[PDB]
Each structure stands twice: as C-alpha cells, then as structure tokens.
Scaffold this active site. Structure first.
Site, PDB file in Angstrom:
ATOM      1  N   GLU A   1     -18.384  12.131 -15.189  1.00 12.56           N
ATOM      2  CA  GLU A   1     -18.169  13.440 -14.808  1.00 12.56           C
ATOM      3  C   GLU A   1     -16.621  13.522 -14.673  1.00 12.56           C
TER       4      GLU A   1
ATOM      5  CB  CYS B   1     -13.733  17.875 -10.690  1.00 13.81           C
ATOM      6  SG  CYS B   1     -13.144  16.317 -10.552  1.00 13.81           S
TER       7      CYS B   1
END
Lengths: 534, 544
Positions: free
Chosen positions: A285, A319
C-alpha cells in the site's frame, strides 16, 4: 463470530478516558524506553544504537533501540521457521483468540498507554491517536479474526462417496512485514494479519513509531502469542530488504510505504526468483495524491471543514490526505474567504500539553526538510501563490504551519507529487469547464488512492462517480477523503498507489493463506477401465 | 441517497454430469459423427481482433498427435504490430464492458456453458480428441465437464460476490464496486486441457477485464472452437482477442505495454519466472502493478501404507500415471510402496499393464490412452527411457518402447528406482513414465519426510491407507507437499467446486481456480462512501 466496531471515545472533561490518558501522558514525560530486538523471547542488543525522538520536542528521546544486523536477521528467520509448523497446525479459532484477547486489552486496560505512546512518539493529537492506536487496531484484530474464523466455513461440495475439505494453510516460509510511521494500527495489521493466518513474521517497525510499535508487540505476546511467531526486528531499511529478499524461505512481503521502496523490493524478489522455495507474495500500500472535487452545488460549510480536516489532520501525513482541491470560480470567493479565516484559528503545538491543538509537528528532520523544499518551490513557481501559512520552525520540534496554496496550473508538479505534509493546493476552474476538469482530476497524477466529490446534484454525482471510477479506490461523496473505518470502508487503491488488497475488508486475509484441498474417498476404487471402452 | 444500489441476485448451478457414451447412445453417435467431421480436414484459424479475422505470414500447423500426417489446423502467429493493435482495441472497449452489470457479463458464460453442454458438446470433444490426442472420457471431463463447470461456477461466484458488502452506519452508506483491473490481461494457456484456456481467458473477462488470449499451438483447434462459442454466446468484440503467437514474442510485447495489468498463465515454471522478471524489469512503465497468476508443473506422489487396499492402489495409480499419457500437472510419477506389499502390488501392476491398449482414440474407443502431444515431448520422453536403461539405479519393469513413425506413440512405462533421490524421482517428464521406490515398512515415517523433501514441487499427492492414525499423521506431515491431497483416491481429476486446484512450492501461485476465491485476483475493488448529512465543524469537542 459476531463483531462490531470499537466505539470512538469523546474524551470530554472529567471523563474516565481523558483522566486515564492524562495519566498515561504523564507516565511518558521525561522517559526513554530501551527497546531491544526480540527473537523468540530473547532481548537482543546490537551496537547499532538508534533513537526515536518526540516530534514536537526532539530533545526528548522517547526510545533507544537498535538495528538488527544481517546475522541477527538470519537467526530470526531460522527461529521463526522452526516455530511455524506447530503454529500453522493450530485451529484457526485458537490463533484468533490471541488477537481477540489483544483487542480486549487495547480496548480497556492498555488503551491510555497505546494512545499516549502514539501521541508522544509520533506526534498525534488525542483524537488522531484514538482513531488509530485504539479503534483501528482493535477493529483490525476483531474483524480479521471474524473473517478468518468464517473463512473456515467456506467449504467445497462433497458428493458420495467422497468428502472434500479445504484447509487454509499459512504460507510456507516467513513473511517480512514493513510498517510506516503514520499509523500504529498499520504495523499491528501488517504483522498481525499474516500471523493470524498461520504465518511467522519478521516485523521491521518504523524507526519513528518504535515506542508505540513495541507496545503493540508486547500486548500481543501478553495475549498469548507464542515465541518466534512475530520477531520484533528494527533495522536499516536497505539492510532488512537485502536480507529478507536473499533468503530462500521468503514467502511474502507485507509493505506499507513509498512507491520506490516497494518497487525496489519487487525487483529484488524478481532478481532472486530462482533461490526461493516458492513464489513470494508482495502486498504494498503506497501513497496517493488525493483530491477533493467541488461542484457548484456543494454545501460550502462541508467543503471547508472536510477539506481542512483531510488536508491538515496529523499534519497531512496520511496516504489518503487531500492535497489537491478543485473549486468552481462561482464558489471561490466563499471557499477562499472561509478557508483563510478558519486557517488563522488552527492551533499547532504540543498535543500532550495542549488538547486545544489541532495538529502538531511533522514526524522527523527528513520530513521537515522535504516539506520545506515544497514550500520553497511554492515561493518560486510562477503558477503558485501561498495564500496562508508557509512558516516552519525546527528549533524545538519539527513544526510546519498549515499552508494553503493556489495554483494557476492544474498540471503543476505540486498538483502531482505526494508531499506528506500540511500543504493544500487549490485549483480554481471555470464553472462551464466542469467536465473538462473532472477529466483532469482523473488524468493529472499517477495515483489512485482516495478522492471526494462535494455536490448536491444527483446527476452530477452519478456522472462524477462513473468518470472517477479508477481515480480513487476509496471514493467519497460529501465527506472527507481520510478516515476509512475497518469493516465499513476497506482501504486501498490501484494505479501507483499499490496492489490494493483492501485491508479492512473480508478478502485481505486471503493473501496470507495458500489453501489445500483434501479429498477422502470412502469406498474402494473400481477397475481402471471405463465402461465405454468395452 | 444520490447513489442507489441494486439488490444482488443468487444463482443455482450444479456440476455438469459426465456422460457414459454407451453403445447406441445419442452422445456416442454424436461424437462419432463429430469425429468423422474432422477426418481429413484442416481448419484455417485466423487471429481475431475485434471481429476482424487477420492473417500474418507466420504460418503454423497443428498436427494430430496419433497421426501427425494429419494437419488438423493451419493458423498464424500474431506479429508485434497486430498484438499492439489488439491491445489498443481491447483498451478502447474496456470501460463499457467493466460498467456492464456483473449479471449481464455472467449471462454470456452461462449461455456458452449451455451451448457446450448440448449442441456443441460433440464438436469440442472431437476437436480435443483429434487435436490433442485425448480419448473419449478424457475429452469429456475436460472440454465439456470442466470447461462448463468453470463457466457456471465462476458465474455463480461472481454474481454472489456483489452481495459481499461492508457495514453502513449513520450518517453514511458504504458500497463496494468490484471493478475490473484497469489495463489488459494476457492469458497464456497450455496444450493439455481445453478447459484451462477457456478459464484463463474467460474468468478475467467475466470480472470486467479485457484479454489477449494466446492459446497453445498444440491445442489450437479446440481452443478456437471455444473462442467461437463465447462470441456466439454474446461476448462483445475486443473483450477477448484471439492471438496465437510465438511465446517469447508475445511475452515481450505484453510486458512492454504500460497498460498490462495481469498475466494469467499455465505452463512451465521457467516461462513463468521469465515473465515475472520481464514485468519487474518494466516496473516503472506500468500504470499499475500487474498481477501475475501461474500454475505450473508437479512431480506428484502416490504414497502407500501397509494397510492400503491393494486393488485401489493399482487401479488409481494406473489411471493417475497413464491417463492422457501422463500429460497432466497432477499425474502420479512417483509411487512409494512398503516392502510388505510390493510383491502383491508389483504382480498386479505388471498384469494390468499388459492389458493397457495404446492406439488411435478416434478409431478405437478401446484405447486407454494415445500418443503424446508432439515431437518435442516424444524426444524428451525418449531421453528419459534411455536414462532408465543407462542408470544403474533404475530398472524398467514394464514397457519402455516408443515409435514416432505414425504418431508420437509411447508405451506406458513402469520403472523401479533403488535410489529415492534419483533424478527421475525429481524431474517432471510429462509422459507415461511411473517410477516406483520400495521402502522398508518400519521406515514409513522417514520415507514420508522423503516424499516431502525430494522434489521442488507441491501440486498433488495421495496416501493409500486404511489406518486412521496413519492417515491423520500423513495428512499433517504432507501438508505442504500437495495443494490437492487425496486419501484413498488417485492424484488426478480435480472437479470444479469440489476440489479447487493448485499448489505452491515450485508449482505456482496457487490461486485455486475451481474455487470461490479465484475470481478475486481479477477484480480491484473500489469502496464508495456517501454521506447524507452536512459535516460539522473541523474542531472536535474535546479540544474545547
């Protein structure tokens, strides 16, 4: 197995949780924990001594730890491999029990501790620590447990005279878990989810989240995790990567972090493909360059508060943080005026001593320098204008004020590159160019992680949803682009944002099992010939 | 609510029944006619891009394995230009296909499944027999039953997957959209199962992907038949491009495209590793991280305990080792027998061996198995037979001859090794070559460890035993030696929905085609949260 989300506490004055957290914060004031590498039950020290500093007061060394060397990492692999068979043979429910117990501990007696260690060590405010080190981590543990236990009920068809059964084996070998500084919970999940599925793990926690990471580790051990199932092995990044990708026994890498690092590991695995006993599974990720797109029908108050939170909470170190805001000309005077007014009221400061703090210092010296480079670029670029903020001061902590920038160029580098800091760039588009601008939202960056559309017009929302289908793996309508909740918004995206295995959802654990199907036949076999051959 | 979500449907499917092909039966008469339909025929099979039939200069032939004078198909290799044109056209078709309701995509495969089951059954069986050298029953379990089951079960799994939705709490509604992967998928299929080609290309297509399908040269005839049926069933143009090609050339092209999002591969381990490395080499060019799926070979075992049913051991082992000439990823090639049972088992194997008929599967339904696939396979097997003669550790107990004058004919061969680590115990031959190692009864545990450690593979294996404690022990010990593990049954013939197929170690990524999770490799989910109330202040109450 029935599970629900952990409540997010309000921390009102005189509440039990606020009192407990205040005490836990006091428990850490002036303290340095010496955190060893842990292989099995052995506490190991190397000479490669390192320190974790409190981001808002870098004079405070919150932990002293050390980097495992190649030899120590190799020992940790060997010890883990030796424990794997018995762990994998344990009933899924028995492994689940460890995580459920850990969840109860985090919910109750250990809550204040893990919140405080996340606040002091990673610079989080009360609520950011609460949604992370408590709620999200607890939810990962409870939900993954449920998903895993229920997965054992996913069985094939049996037809007489045979019985078929699927065994959800852990992967054969060891898994390397490499976690980022920004969420305590992510470390717990990256190491924990594979371990739940019968794997053994070398966990390299983030240097700048060491204190809270070790707290989670100790809780797992206290909750009943046997020795050598998760090895706690801080290390130099390249050294750790080189070592695990050189082992014939590597079966997975569970990574969260930078695109270039994930790509490097992927290439290292490919270079060594002939050495491995099986094909390693890589899960990654990575970052995003996330948008909030505003249509002229939007509720302005929601746009303003949602954007301030998404862009600036935890200093924009998410993120999923909004870093590009697209606004129609007709709404710009309202949104600009409101953003600038609310901006002046944001408090940046010590989150332990002042609960009035909206967000605090960024994580470390390197982040501070990187973000300053972007502020300097914003002062240089002909297309960029700083509207507010832009100040920074690293004399006491790594303090960066929230910064709002307007770009006249929707393709400016600042519109494309992930900063991971409290830096919001706004592009104002002509109302009659909404469609062209939606296309720009989709085409401008290399990323595909999060995005939001603010609009009160149904046709617009339907059109935007279709158009942005692959611009965001977590897509929001009239809400901010951050704050995914386990079991409600499974998290992840594609394009350059990673492999999108959706941690937080029911399928994530499938990456950490390699199923075996057993067919038992209960009647002797007949002749080898077939009747049609006669 | 500005977004409205449909109720999800359910689908009832069951396994396709295996037909009996008894004398005087409609399916037997139909198959005979379909076989006659192919006698002396060569089909010119083009590349298909969209609806355009394209020919290149790279003309190739598929030969009938048991009568290699018979060119069953003439086809051509797509050049790099055509492959890139196919990519472009597929990509331009993708968004519409992905946006189609899952149920509408599923309908295509359910219609195809029904066509294969009924009116097209004889055709696909006959083309698999004549083109790949399969006997009636091998074609039936493959080109009909397994392919039909893939289409039906994957359709069920896919439609039902949309019902897997997250929790919503006020003031918001959460929904998961099971997006196809953004880009194109390359599907690369093997000669040995017609059904595998259909699944490799078809499963990703079902999930909203677009696909370049490079079928196996030596299964071209049957593969094109499947492709045509899919199009006839309503698959739109440019969703699956039919593009036979040189293997390296195809791999070079697809791994050089920024839009590659997956490779669905079944074949040799070295080829899979090569593709994996090419993707890694080109990692910086791709719009997203490609998903590689690979099922490769095995070196599969039947392990016999002293308590085993001798007759079951013999019949199950003969079938596993020799059906379709042992050209199965799951075929038994190493048999471990305890000394106490070896006299009985050896006697029986040798007796039954002498009754195995090898010949023309179209002309003689008495044939147990026929020629191996091609000259390359024949040559390799021949070298192994020669190794058996030359190696002091090896002895040929039965068979050992071969003849390529008319077809690529190899006798079933049974070899005894005195060395459990002999190369023939380790390396996949993909031929009708069974190696037996006899172990002392009291060393069964040590021998179980050898079964686990001797090869690089982890695909299939069987234990034959009537002792419960032994079965339990072996099951534990052999947990990672076989992804498909069998107790008192042969190591081949996994059935969709019953024994999802695949294994780890060197045998591949183990994504279990045939099971409910396989389709998850071909979707990249998006989650949408719609909030129905205005947001509050940016501050939190505790900050007051």
């Amino acid at each position: 197995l029935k599970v629900a989300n952990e409540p997010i506490l309000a921390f009102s004055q005189g509440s039990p949780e606020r009192d407990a957290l205040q005490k836990a914060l006091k428990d850490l004031k002036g303290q340095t924990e010496a955190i060893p590498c842990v292989v099995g039950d052995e506490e190991v020290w190397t000479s490669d001594i390192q320190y974790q500093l409190s981001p808002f007061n870098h004079a405070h060394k919150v932990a002293k730890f050390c980097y495992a060397d190649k030899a120590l990492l190799n020992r940790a692999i060997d010890a883990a491999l030796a424990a794997r068979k018995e762990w994998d043979l344990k009933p899924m429910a028995d492994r689940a029990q460890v995580f459920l117990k850990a969840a109860d501990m985090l919910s109750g007696p250990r809550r204040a501790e893990v919140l405080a260690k996340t606040m002091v060590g990673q610079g989080k405010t009360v609520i950011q620590a609460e949604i992370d080190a408590a709620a999200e981590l607890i939810d990962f543990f409870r939900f993954n447990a449920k998903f895993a236990v229920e997965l054992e009920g996913e069985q094939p068809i049996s037809v007489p005279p045979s019985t078929n059964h699927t065994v959800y084996r852990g992967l054969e070998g060891f898994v390397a878990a490499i976690s980022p500084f920004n969420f305590t919970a992510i470390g717990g999940n990256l190491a924990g989810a594979p371990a739940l599925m019968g794997n053994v793990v070398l966990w390299k926690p983030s240097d700048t989240a060491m204190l809270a990471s070790y707290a989670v580790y100790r809780i797992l051990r206290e909750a009943g995790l046997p020795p050598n199932i998760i090895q706690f092995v801080p290390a130099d990044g390249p050294t750790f990567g080189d070592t695990v990708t050189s082992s014939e026994h590597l079966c997975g890498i569970n990574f969260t972090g930078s695109v270039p690092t994930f790509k490097h590991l992927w290439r290292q695995v490919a270079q060594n493909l002939d050495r491995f006993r099986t094909f390693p599974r890589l899960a990654g990720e990575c970052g995003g360059k996330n948008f909030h797109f505003v249509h002229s029908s939007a509720d302005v108050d929601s746009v303003v508060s949602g954007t301030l939170r998404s862009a600036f909470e935890y200093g924009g170190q998410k993120c999923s943080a909004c870093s590009r805001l697209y606004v129609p000309k007709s709404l710009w005077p309202q949104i600009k005026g409101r953003l600038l007014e609310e901006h002046s009221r944001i408090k940046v400061g010590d989150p332990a001593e002042d609960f009035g703090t909206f967000f605090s210092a960024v994580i470390d010296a390197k982040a501070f320098a990187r973000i300053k480079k972007w502020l300097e670029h914003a002062r240089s670029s002909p297309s960029l204008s700083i509207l507010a903020g832009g100040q920074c001061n690293e004399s006491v902590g790594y303090y960066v004020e929230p910064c709002i920038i307007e770009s006249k160029d929707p393709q400016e580098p600042i519109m494309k590159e992930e900063i991971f800091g409290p830096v919001l760039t706004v592009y104002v588009y002509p109302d009659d160019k909404y469609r062209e601008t939606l296309k720009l939202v989709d085409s401008t960056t290399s990323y595909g992680l999060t995005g939001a559309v603010f609009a009160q017009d149904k046709a617009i929302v339907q059109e935007a949803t279709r158009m942005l289908r692959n611009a965001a793996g977590n897509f929001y309508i009239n809400d901010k682009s951050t704050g995914s909740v386990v079991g409600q918004q499974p998290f992840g995206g594609a394009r350059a944002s990673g492999t999108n295995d959706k941690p937080g959802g029911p399928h994530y654990i499938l990456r950490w099992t390699s199923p075996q199907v057993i067919k038992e036949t209960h009647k002797p076999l007949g002749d080898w010939r077939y009747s049609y051959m006669q």
